[PDB]
Amino acid sequence: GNPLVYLDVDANGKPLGRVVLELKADVVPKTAENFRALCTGEKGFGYKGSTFHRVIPSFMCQAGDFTNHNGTGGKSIYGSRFPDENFTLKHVGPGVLSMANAGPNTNGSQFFICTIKTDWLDGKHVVFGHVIEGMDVVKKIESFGSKSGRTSKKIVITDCGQLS
Ligand SMILES: O=C(CN1C(=O)[C@@H]2[C@H]3CC[C@H](C3)[C@@H]2C1=O)NCc1ccc2c(c1)[C@H]1C[C@@H](N2)[C@H](O)CO1
Fold first, then answer.
1. Which ligand 1 atom sits nearest the alpha carbon of residue 56?
2. Which residues carry this modification: N6-succinyllysine?
3. Cα 71 to middle of ligand 1, angstroms
4. Which residues are catalytic?
5. CA distance 38 to 42
6. In whole angstroms, what separates CA 3 from the centre of its chain?
7. From edge to edge, which strands make up the β-sheet containing 96-99?
8. Alpha helices, DSSP H only, in 113-159?
9. How far is ligand 1, taken at its centre, from the CA of residue 106, in Å?
């Protein structure tokens, strides 16, 4: 089966709730495994204690830069970057979970959750899962962003892990 993982997210130290994500290991096993392991922290690094550093309302919420905390960093469980696995899954609507990148074959740990259909990203960003529950929490995160992407409170992944 596919992994279920979770992110517990706070704003300025106040809890927003839990986002539960299905990782599509049946379609993108390498990409799913990277995210899963970064949620559990089992490689010695991962998302716990890192931030949503760019949040654009009516677009997406971006996170995963646990090295630089500014959109320049992050790393994968495999190394500093890994190839685009495939583009089979598309950016079909709110709740799509997809890899940030710096061009072709530059996946690390940064990711985004869509708050709209972002189909102009199809074929360019690897989609590897979706929100199962806690879309309301994603909307709370979205409310602390701005058109520039700069957040108005510090949005932190206080805890994360695997449910199954
Ligand atoms: O944030 C972006 C660009 N970017 C956007 O501007 C749009 C926004 C709307 C949907 C998403 C977010 C989309 C997006 O990806 N690039 C930063 C980045 C991402 C991954 C990696 C790196 C840097 C580092 C480390 C590691 N991985 C590799 O070693 C490469 O260098």
1. 9
2. 24, 43, 132, 147
3. 7
4. 54, 59, 62, 101, 112, 121, 125
5. 7
6. 15
7. 52-56, 60-63, 111-114, 96-99, 127-133, 14-23, 4-11, 155-162
8. 135-143
9. 8
